[PDB]
Homo-oligomer: A and B are copies of this chain.
Amino acid sequence: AMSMAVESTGNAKAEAESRAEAARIEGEGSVLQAKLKAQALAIETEAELE
């Protein structure tokens, strides 16, 4: 029972923490792309404003 508990919790935590790490990387990437796209829109619409 102890061995099954540790194996099952390791198997679940691996597939859960890989997803969590990938989601963290995607969140940081998404906010950085949000900054870059914000600059892109704020300059495109500013020039098109003129």
In the complex, the answer to whether A45 meets B36 with C-beta atoms within 8 Å is: no
For chain A residues 1-50, which have a beta carbon within 8 Å of chain B? 1-2, 4-48, 50
CB distance from A13 to the nearest CB of B (A): 5
Instruction: List the number of copies, as a whole number.
Output: 2
Interfacial chain B residues near A31, Cβ < 8 Å: 36-37, 39-40, 43
Set B9, B16, B23, B42: member contacting A33, Cβ < 8 A: B23
Chain A residues with CB under 8 Å of chain B are: 1-2, 4-48, 50
List B contacts of A16 (CB < 8 A). 21-26, 29
B17 and A8 within 8 A (CB): yes
- Chain B residue nearest to A39 (CB atoms) is B31
